[PDB]
Amino acid sequence: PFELSGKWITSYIGSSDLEKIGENAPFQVFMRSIEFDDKESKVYLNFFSKENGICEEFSLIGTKQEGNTYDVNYAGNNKFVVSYASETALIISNINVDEEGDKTIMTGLLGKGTDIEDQDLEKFKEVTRENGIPEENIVNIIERDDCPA
Numbered sequence: 001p002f003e004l005s006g007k008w009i010t011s012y013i014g015s016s017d018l019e020k021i022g023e024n025a026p027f028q029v030f031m032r033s034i035e036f037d038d039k040e041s042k043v044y045l046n047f048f049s050k051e052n053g054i055c056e057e058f059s060l061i062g063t064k065q066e067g068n069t070y071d072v073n074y075a076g077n078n079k080f081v082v083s084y085a086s087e088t089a090l091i092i093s094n095i096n097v098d099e100e101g102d103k104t105i106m107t108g109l110l111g112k113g114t115d116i117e118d119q120d121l122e123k124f125k126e127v128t129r130e131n132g133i134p135e136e137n138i139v140n141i142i143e144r145d146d147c148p149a
Protein backbone atom coordinates (compact mmCIF):
# COMPACT_ATOMS: atom_id res chain seq x y z
CA PRO A 1 0.00 0.00 0.00
CA PHE A 2 1.41 3.28 -0.78
CA GLU A 3 1.61 6.52 1.34
CA LEU A 4 1.72 9.50 -1.04
CA SER A 5 1.82 12.11 1.71
CA GLY A 6 5.10 13.24 3.25
CA LYS A 7 8.52 14.70 2.52
CA TRP A 8 9.16 15.03 -1.23
CA ILE A 9 12.20 16.78 -2.79
CA THR A 10 12.53 17.68 -6.49
CA SER A 11 15.29 15.88 -8.42
CA TYR A 12 14.43 16.76 -12.07
CA ILE A 13 11.95 18.92 -14.01
CA GLY A 14 11.02 18.89 -17.74
CA SER A 15 9.14 21.69 -19.52
CA SER A 16 7.67 22.37 -22.96
CA ASP A 17 8.58 26.07 -22.39
CA LEU A 18 12.18 26.69 -21.22
CA GLU A 19 11.28 30.21 -20.03
CA LYS A 20 9.38 28.68 -17.12
CA ILE A 21 12.23 26.60 -15.61
CA GLY A 22 15.64 28.25 -15.63
CA GLU A 23 17.28 30.51 -13.07
CA ASN A 24 14.71 32.25 -10.87
CA ALA A 25 11.83 31.09 -13.10
CA PRO A 26 8.49 30.31 -11.45
CA PHE A 27 8.70 26.56 -12.10
CA GLN A 28 12.23 25.85 -10.94
CA VAL A 29 10.54 24.43 -7.78
CA PHE A 30 12.43 22.81 -4.91
CA MET A 31 9.77 20.69 -3.27
CA ARG A 32 9.80 19.97 0.49
CA SER A 33 6.47 18.23 1.22
CA ILE A 34 3.10 17.23 -0.18
CA GLU A 35 0.09 16.30 1.98
CA PHE A 36 -3.00 14.76 0.35
CA ASP A 37 -6.15 15.36 2.45
CA ASP A 38 -8.68 13.10 0.74
CA LYS A 39 -11.28 13.75 3.46
CA GLU A 40 -11.36 17.47 2.71
CA SER A 41 -10.55 16.92 -1.00
CA LYS A 42 -7.41 19.10 -0.78
CA VAL A 43 -3.65 18.87 -1.29
CA TYR A 44 -1.03 20.86 0.60
CA LEU A 45 2.22 21.81 -1.13
CA ASN A 46 5.30 23.29 0.53
CA PHE A 47 8.38 24.24 -1.53
CA PHE A 48 11.09 26.79 -2.17
CA SER A 49 11.77 28.80 -5.31
CA LYS A 50 14.20 31.56 -6.16
CA GLU A 51 13.49 35.19 -7.15
CA ASN A 52 16.54 37.47 -7.23
CA GLY A 53 18.59 34.37 -6.66
CA ILE A 54 17.36 34.22 -3.04
CA CYS A 55 15.29 31.35 -1.65
CA GLU A 56 11.61 32.08 -0.96
CA GLU A 57 9.14 29.62 0.61
CA PHE A 58 5.58 28.89 -0.45
CA SER A 59 2.77 26.87 1.15
CA LEU A 60 -0.14 26.30 -1.23
CA ILE A 61 -3.46 24.52 -1.01
CA GLY A 62 -4.97 22.89 -4.09
CA THR A 63 -8.40 21.35 -4.66
CA LYS A 64 -9.13 17.78 -5.61
CA GLN A 65 -10.86 17.60 -8.98
CA GLU A 66 -12.21 14.93 -11.26
CA GLY A 67 -9.96 11.99 -12.06
CA ASN A 68 -7.36 12.33 -9.32
CA THR A 69 -6.32 15.73 -10.68
CA TYR A 70 -5.72 18.83 -8.60
CA ASP A 71 -6.21 22.55 -9.27
CA VAL A 72 -3.89 25.09 -7.66
CA ASN A 73 -3.19 28.79 -8.25
CA TYR A 74 0.52 29.68 -8.65
CA ALA A 75 2.01 31.82 -11.47
CA GLY A 76 -1.32 31.36 -13.24
CA ASN A 77 -3.64 28.35 -13.03
CA ASN A 78 -2.39 24.76 -12.71
CA LYS A 79 -3.97 21.33 -13.14
CA PHE A 80 -1.72 18.48 -12.10
CA VAL A 81 -1.89 14.74 -11.54
CA VAL A 82 0.45 12.30 -9.78
CA SER A 83 1.13 10.18 -12.87
CA TYR A 84 3.35 7.62 -11.12
CA ALA A 85 4.07 6.62 -7.55
CA SER A 86 6.65 4.13 -6.24
CA GLU A 87 7.92 3.65 -2.69
CA THR A 88 10.81 5.97 -3.59
CA ALA A 89 9.27 8.52 -5.98
CA LEU A 90 6.40 10.55 -7.38
CA ILE A 91 6.22 11.78 -11.00
CA ILE A 92 3.91 14.74 -11.37
CA SER A 93 2.51 16.05 -14.66
CA ASN A 94 1.29 19.66 -14.59
CA ILE A 95 -0.36 21.94 -17.13
CA ASN A 96 0.07 25.66 -16.38
CA VAL A 97 -1.77 28.56 -18.09
CA ASP A 98 0.09 31.73 -17.04
CA GLU A 99 -1.25 35.27 -16.69
CA GLU A 100 -0.58 35.93 -20.38
CA GLY A 101 -2.57 32.87 -21.45
CA ASP A 102 0.40 30.78 -22.58
CA LYS A 103 0.13 27.05 -21.86
CA THR A 104 3.02 24.97 -20.63
CA ILE A 105 3.22 21.22 -19.91
CA MET A 106 5.81 20.13 -17.31
CA THR A 107 6.89 16.98 -15.45
CA GLY A 108 8.72 16.60 -12.18
CA LEU A 109 10.41 13.66 -10.49
CA LEU A 110 10.28 13.80 -6.69
CA GLY A 111 12.03 11.65 -4.11
CA LYS A 112 12.77 11.41 -0.35
CA GLY A 113 16.20 13.02 -0.56
CA THR A 114 19.19 13.35 -2.90
CA ASP A 115 19.91 9.68 -3.90
CA ILE A 116 18.06 9.00 -7.15
CA GLU A 117 16.98 5.52 -8.14
CA ASP A 118 17.59 4.99 -11.87
CA GLN A 119 14.36 2.97 -12.26
CA ASP A 120 12.37 6.06 -11.14
CA LEU A 121 14.53 8.31 -13.41
CA GLU A 122 13.83 6.16 -16.50
CA LYS A 123 10.08 6.38 -15.88
CA PHE A 124 10.36 10.19 -15.53
CA LYS A 125 12.22 10.42 -18.88
CA GLU A 126 9.53 8.27 -20.58
CA VAL A 127 6.61 10.33 -19.14
CA THR A 128 8.49 13.49 -20.20
CA ARG A 129 9.06 12.15 -23.71
CA GLU A 130 5.40 11.07 -23.97
CA ASN A 131 4.33 14.60 -23.16
CA GLY A 132 6.29 15.91 -26.19
CA ILE A 133 9.11 17.45 -24.05
CA PRO A 134 12.62 16.89 -25.48
CA GLU A 135 15.50 15.50 -23.42
CA GLU A 136 17.34 18.80 -23.65
CA ASN A 137 14.43 20.52 -21.85
CA ILE A 138 15.19 18.51 -18.65
CA VAL A 139 16.91 20.40 -15.80
CA ASN A 140 18.74 18.67 -12.93
CA ILE A 141 17.17 20.28 -9.82
CA ILE A 142 19.12 18.47 -7.12
CA GLU A 143 22.25 20.18 -8.48
CA ARG A 144 20.51 23.58 -8.11
CA ASP A 145 18.76 23.19 -4.76
CA ASP A 146 20.78 25.02 -2.14
CA CYS A 147 17.64 26.32 -0.29
CA PRO A 148 17.06 25.22 3.40
CA ALA A 149 15.90 21.88 4.30
Ligand SMILES: O=C(c1ccccc1)c1ccccc1
Pocket (backbone or CB within 6 Å): 010, 013, 027, 029, 031, 045, 072, 074, 078, 080, 092, 094, 106, 107, 108, 109, 110
Ligand atom coordinates in the same frame (compact mmCIF):
# COMPACT_ATOMS: atom_id res chain seq x y z
O1 LIG B 1 5.12 22.41 -11.68
C1 LIG B 1 4.85 21.97 -10.37
C2 LIG B 1 5.69 20.84 -9.79
C3 LIG B 1 7.09 20.92 -9.79
C4 LIG B 1 7.86 19.88 -9.27
C5 LIG B 1 7.22 18.74 -8.74
C6 LIG B 1 5.83 18.63 -8.73
C7 LIG B 1 5.06 19.69 -9.26
C8 LIG B 1 3.74 22.63 -9.60
C9 LIG B 1 2.43 22.19 -9.77
C10 LIG B 1 1.41 22.79 -9.08
C11 LIG B 1 1.68 23.85 -8.21
C12 LIG B 1 2.98 24.30 -8.04
C13 LIG B 1 4.01 23.68 -8.74
